[PDB]
Every structure is written in structure tokens, then in C-alpha cells.
Amino acid sequence: KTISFNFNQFHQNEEQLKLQRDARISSNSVLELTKVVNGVPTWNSTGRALYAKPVQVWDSTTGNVASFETRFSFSIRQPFPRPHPADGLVFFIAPPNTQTGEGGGYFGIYNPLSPYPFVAVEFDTFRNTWDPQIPHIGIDVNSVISTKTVPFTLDNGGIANVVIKYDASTKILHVVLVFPSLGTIYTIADIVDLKQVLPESVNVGFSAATGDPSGKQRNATETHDILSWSFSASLPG
Amino acid sequence: KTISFNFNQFHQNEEQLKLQRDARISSNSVLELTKVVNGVPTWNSTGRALYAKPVQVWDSTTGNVASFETRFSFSIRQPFPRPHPADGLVFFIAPPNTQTGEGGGYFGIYNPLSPYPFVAVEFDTFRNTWDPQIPHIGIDVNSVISTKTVPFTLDNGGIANVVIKYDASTKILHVVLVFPSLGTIYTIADIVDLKQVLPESVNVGFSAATGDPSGKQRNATETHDILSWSFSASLPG
Numbered sequence: 001k002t003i004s005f006n007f008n009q010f011h012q013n014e015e016q017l018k019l020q021r022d023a024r025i026s027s028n029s030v031l032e033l034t035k036v037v038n039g040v041p042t043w044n045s046t047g048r049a050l051y052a053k054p055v056q057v058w059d060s061t062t063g064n065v066a067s068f069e070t071r072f073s074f075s076i077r078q079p080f081p082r083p084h085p086a087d088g089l090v091f092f093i094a095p096p097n098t099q100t101g102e103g104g105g106y107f108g109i110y111n112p113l114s115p116y117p118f119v120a121v122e123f124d125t126f127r128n129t130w131d132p133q134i135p136h137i138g139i140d141v142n143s144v145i146s147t148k149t150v151p152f153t154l155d156n157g158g159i160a161n162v163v164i165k166y167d168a169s170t171k172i173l174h175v176v177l178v179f180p181s182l183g184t185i186y187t188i189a190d191i192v193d194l195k196q197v198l199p200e201s202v203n204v205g206f207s208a209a210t211g212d213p214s215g216k217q218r219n220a221t222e223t224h225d226i227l228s229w230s231f232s233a234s235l236p237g
Numbered sequence: 238k239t240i241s242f243n244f245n246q247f248h249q250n251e252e253q254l255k256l257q258r259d260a261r262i263s264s265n266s267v268l269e270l271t272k273v274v275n276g277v278p279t280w281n282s283t284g285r286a287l288y289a290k291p292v293q294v295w296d297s298t299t300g301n302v303a304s305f306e307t308r309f310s311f312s313i314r315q316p317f318p319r320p321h322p323a324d325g326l327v328f329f330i331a332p333p334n335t336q337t338g339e340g341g342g343y344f345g346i347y348n349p350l351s352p353y354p355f356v357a358v359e360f361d362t363f364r365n366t367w368d369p370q371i372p373h374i375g376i377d378v379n380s381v382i383s384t385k386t387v388p389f390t391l392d393n394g395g396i397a398n399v400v401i402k403y404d405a406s407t408k409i410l411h412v413v414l415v416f417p418s419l420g421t422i423y424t425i426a427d428i429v430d431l432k433q434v435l436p437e438s439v440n441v442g443f444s445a446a447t448g449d450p451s452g453k454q455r456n457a458t459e460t461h462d463i464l465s466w467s468f469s470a471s472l473p474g
């Protein structure tokens with residue numbers, strides 16, 4: 001049992017993708033998770049992009065957990081340095097058929113009213129009360145309060161290469177963040193037991209959010225674009 | 238307690254480094270682990286470079302183990318494609334005052350008639366009987382038979398950026414290998430309990446080796462140069 005897909009670019013109305021909320025595919029093939037009008041990112045925006053088909057991360061019959069690798073490129077342009085860009089984007093895994101959660105610092109994956117489990121890798125750009133300095137990469141399990149975090153310096157408008165890998169045998173989830181133009185490399189890892197937090201079948205995808213109106217700052221925004229995305233999972237059995 | 242050092246280049250007669258065997262610092266700031274005469278790598282060569290001062294990875298009094306991060310750049314030029322370049326270079330941690338071990342596939346860190354413990358990250362370029370395909374990154378603990386391995390494609394003569402990170406809390410050792418010219422990223426991780434394999438005080442450094450005479454192949458060689466090296470360790474004790 002080994003699923004696998006890759007998108008070297010995105011075509012309008014991708015039959016393979018499921019767009020939610022403000023997420024849209026631009027004319028030139030980029031996946032814009034958050035609203036951007038006339039080259040200008042907007043606040044009060046939230047969008048998700050899920051891979052249309054559910055993937056099986058573990059089998060209850062055998063007890064086996066899948067290993068997976070996912071690579072993608074993103075770009076975050078922060079047009080307004082003052083007072084503070086927000087909020088960031090995440091790659092996540094959650095039960096199938098979920099609805100967009102709260103925006104702002106919750107990236108659209110956390111729903112306080114009705115919480116669903118989820119594992120996510122965040123690229124946080126706004127410092128909430130529960131956050132260490134930003135920007136930072138964080139590993140989230142059922143909460144936006146990261147288990148592990150590492151700070152990084154964003155290449156404004158530049159391209160970012162990300163590699164997220166999970167080894168079922170060691171239960172190690174390690175992510176690598178590289179900004180090819182700056183030559184900088186950021187790494188973070190932690191132990192996560194998928195079998196323990198997620199159901200056998202899940203959805204994989206992205207979610208992003210810009211400044212929440214409650215913050216009263218229209219400048220709290222930025223773009224959250226995804227240029228490419230490949231995914232591979234291998235469930236032995 | 239925190240320790241750290243940085244080398245943006247290397248200077249001849251460096252007081253902070255301890256060179257062993259064939260290791261020498263070139264006129265233009267590169268650390269040549271293995272012998273190279275007039276722009277040509279030689280076989281039957283072995284060299285190590287250790288950081289002059291010992292570092293404390295764990296404290297017996299508190300039982301605490303240190304976390305550390307090390308970044309370095311290396312270059313391996315393989316002039317003779319046939320029959321097979323050899324053998325590779327490694328970054329290692331060992332008890333202080335050890336001497337260069339056997340060359341060839343032992344990289345100079347393993348001494349059969351007087352084994353000492355060690356944790357090492359290898360960049361193997363020659364396939365010994367105990368090796369999977371090469372080149373490959375491997376995590377070695379007391380043995381050249383890696384616990385975990387990952388294949389990679391070398392950028393012949395190109396520059397390679399490496400990031401090795403160890404988190405005491407999770408005991409996760411993760412290494413990242415990036416070839417900026419090719420834009421390729423390789424990642425590997427494993428669990429290693431330093432406190433369990435190493436003494437409180439250790440030496441950190443590099444070791445490399447070229448084809449062993451027993452192989453009767455003079456072309457079994459390559460360069461093993463290190464361009465830069467930074468280190469940082471944190472013992473909350």
C-alpha cells in the first residue's frame with residue numbers, strides 16, 4: 001500500500017485538489033491560500049487546500065504505521081513591515097471531511113468549538129501569547145501551542161523549500177526549511193505517534209491565515225503561496 | 238554552560254585545531270583531511286582534525302546531557318571515476334586523546350585492536366561489504382555499520398552544506414545535507430543516547446580516508462576538504 005502524487009504546478013479547478021474558503025489558484029499556476037487583491041494581500045483571510053483523496057496513515061488490522069515524505073515550495077511576501085505581518089501557513093494532517101477552523105493565530109486548522117485531532121508543521125509569522133519569537137517553525141499536535149519550535153529568518157517574497165519526513169519505525173518527524181537565495185538552512189524534529197493521535201484515514205494539505213479583524217490592524221497580512229507539492233506515503237502490508 | 242566556536246576558513250598553524258596524520262591546512266584556507274599532491278588526491282591517505290579543547294556532552298552529577306548543533310561545508314572532488322572513488326569523510330565525537338584509527342572504509346575512526354566508543358555522521362563514497370549503495374549518509378554508533386542510511390548524489394567538486402543537530406530531550410540526531418548548486422536536499426535522523434555511549438568529556442572533529450593499498454587501486458581516491466565549521470553545545474549543568 002503506497003500512495004503518491006506530485007504537482008509541479010497547479011491548474012485552475014484542479015480535480016485533484018479541494019479548495020476551501022479564500023484559497024484560490026492564480027492564473028499563473030500558484031496556489032494562493034490567502035486572499036490577495038491586485039497584488040496586495042488582505043487581512044481577515046483564511047484558506048485551505050486539501051488533497052482530494054484520503055490517505056491511509058495506519059492499518060488497525062496489522063497495527064502498522066505509514067512512513068511518508070512530502071516536499072513543497074512556498075513564498076511569503078510581507079508588503080507591510082509595520083506593525084506586524086500575520087499569521088503564517090501550515091502543512092497538516094487531519095481526519096477527512098473537516099471544515100476550516102478559526103483564522104488568525106489558529107491558521108484555520110483549530111476549531112475551539114468543535115476540535116478535531118491534527119498533526120501540523122507551522123511557519124508562524126505572528127507572535128501570539130503562546131508563541132516564542134517569530135518567525136518560527138513549529139511542530140503542532142492537536143494544538144497551535146507547538147511541542148517544538150525553531151526560529152528562522154524569512155526571505156521576504158523569496159522562495160522556500162520544505163522537506164517534511166516521517167519514519168514510522170522511529171516515530172521521528174523531521175522538517176527542513178531552506179531558502180535557496182540566502183543559502184540558509186533550518187532544521188527541526190520531534191517524536192510523534194500518528195497512530196496515537198490520528199484515525200486510519202486522513203487528509204493532507206495546507207492552511208493559512210492573515211490578520212484577524214479583532215486585532216484592528218489591516219496591515220497584519222501577507223501572502224501564503226504554494227508553488228509546488230509532492231507527497232509519498234508507504235504503508236507496509 | 239554553553240560552548241561554541243566558528244571557522245569561516247582555516248589558517249595554517251591554527252591553535253584551536255589539532256591535526257593528525259595526513260591532515261593539513263592549505264595555503265588558501267581549506268582543511269584538507271586527505272593527502273593531495275599538485276591538485277591530485279592520493280590513495281593510502283588518512284587524516285583527522287579535532288577541536289583542540291574537549292567538550293562536555295553530559296554531566297554525571299546532574300545526569301543531564303547536552304544538546305548541540307554543528308554546521309559545516311565540505312567538498313569532495315572525484316578525479317578518477319573508474320574503478321571507484323574512496324572512501325569518504327565523517328564528523329565524529331570520541332573520547333579525548335584518541336589516535337587515528339584504521340584507514341579505508343574505517344575512515345580513520347575505528348581502531349580494531351583498541352576500539353573506543355564514538356558517534357559519527359558519515360558521507361560514504363565507497364561500497365564496502367557492509368555498505369548499501371553509495372554515496373550515502375549514515376549514522377554510526379561504535380561501528381562503521383550504520384544504524385540508519387540514506388542515499389545521495391554527490392555534486393562532484395561542488396560545495397556541500399551540512400547541518401547536524403542533536404536534541405537531548407528527544408535524543409534525536411538529525412542531519413541535513415544540501416548541495417546549493419543542484420538545489421538538492423537530503424535528510425536523515427535517528428535516536429542516539431549519547432550518555433549511554435560516550436564519556437562526559439569528548440573531542441569533536443572530522444576524519445577522512447582514501448583508497449587502501451590492499452584494494453590495489455590507485456584511482457580509489459578523492460579529496461575530502463572542509464571549507465568552514467561552526468559548533469555550539471548546551472549543557473544545562
Ligand SMILES: *[C@@H]1O[C@H](CO)[C@@H](O[C@@H]2O[C@H](CO)[C@@H](O)[C@H](O)[C@H]2NC(C)=O)[C@H](O[C@@H]2O[C@@H](C)[C@@H](O)[C@@H](O)[C@@H]2O)[C@H]1NC(C)=O
Nearest residue numbers: 040078079080081082083084085215216217218219220221
Ligand atoms: C500600514 O502599512 C502602511 C504601508 O507600509 C504604512 O504606511 C506607510 O508608512 C510609512 C512609515 O512606516 C510612510 O513613510 C509611508 O508614507 C506610508 N505609506 C503610505 C503612503 O501609505 C502604515 O504606516 C502608518 O500609516 C501611514 C499612513 C503613516 O502615517 C506612517 O507614519 C504610519 O506608521 C502602516 N500602519 C501602521 C499602524 O504601521
Ligand SMILES: *[C@@H]1O[C@H](CO)[C@@H](O[C@@H]2O[C@H](CO)[C@@H](O)[C@H](O)[C@H]2NC(C)=O)[C@H](O[C@@H]2O[C@@H](C)[C@@H](O)[C@@H](O)[C@@H]2O)[C@H]1NC(C)=O
Nearest residue numbers: 277315316317318319320321322452453454455456457458
Ligand atoms: C586510473 O585512472 C586513470 C585516469 O582516468 C585512467 O586512465 C585514463 O583512462 C581514460 C579512459 O579509461 C583515458 O581516456 C585517459 O587517457 C587515461 N588517463 C591517463 C593519461 O592515464 C586509468 O584507466 C586505465 O589506464 C588507461 C591508461 C587505459 O589503459 C584504460 O583502459 C585503463 O582502464 C584508471 N585505471 C583504472 C584502474 O581504472
Ligand SMILES: *[C@@H]1O[C@H](CO)[C@@H](O)[C@H](O[C@@H]2O[C@@H](C)[C@@H](O)[C@@H](O)[C@@H]2O)[C@H]1NC(C)=O
Nearest residue numbers: 021022043044045046103211212213214216
Ligand atoms: C471578514 O470576512 C468576513 C467573511 O468571512 C466578512 O463578512 C467580514 O465583514 C464584516 O462582517 C460582516 C458580517 C458584515 O457585517 C460586514 O459589513 C463586516 O465588514 C470581514 N470582517 C471585516 C471587519 O472586514
Ligand SMILES: *[C@@H]1O[C@H](CO)[C@@H](O)[C@H](O)[C@H]1NC(C)=O
Nearest residue numbers: 258259280281282283450451
Ligand atoms: C602507505 O602509507 C604508509 C604511511 O603513511 C607507508 O608506511 C606505506 O609504505 C604506504 N603504503 C604504500 C604501498 O604506499
Ligand SMILES: OC[C@H]1O[C@H](O)[C@H](O)[C@@H](O)[C@H]1O
Nearest residue numbers: 086104105211212215217220
Ligand atoms: O492583528 C493581527 C493579530 O490579531 C489577533 O491578535 C490574532 O489573534 C493574531 O493571531 C493576529 O491575527
Ligand SMILES: OC[C@H]1O[C@H](O)[C@H](O)[C@@H](O)[C@H]1O
Nearest residue numbers: 323341342448449452454457
Ligand atoms: O580499493 C579501495 C578499497 O580497498 C579496500 O577494499 C578497502 O577496505 C576499501 O575501504 C577501499 O579503500
Ligand SMILES: [Ca+2]
Nearest residue numbers: 105124126128
Ligand atoms: Ca502565531
Ligand SMILES: [Ca+2]
Nearest residue numbers: 342361363365
Ligand atoms: Ca564505505
Ligand SMILES: [Mn+2]
Nearest residue numbers: 124131138146
Ligand atoms: Mn507558533
Ligand SMILES: [Mn+2]
Nearest residue numbers: 361368369375
Ligand atoms: Mn557506509
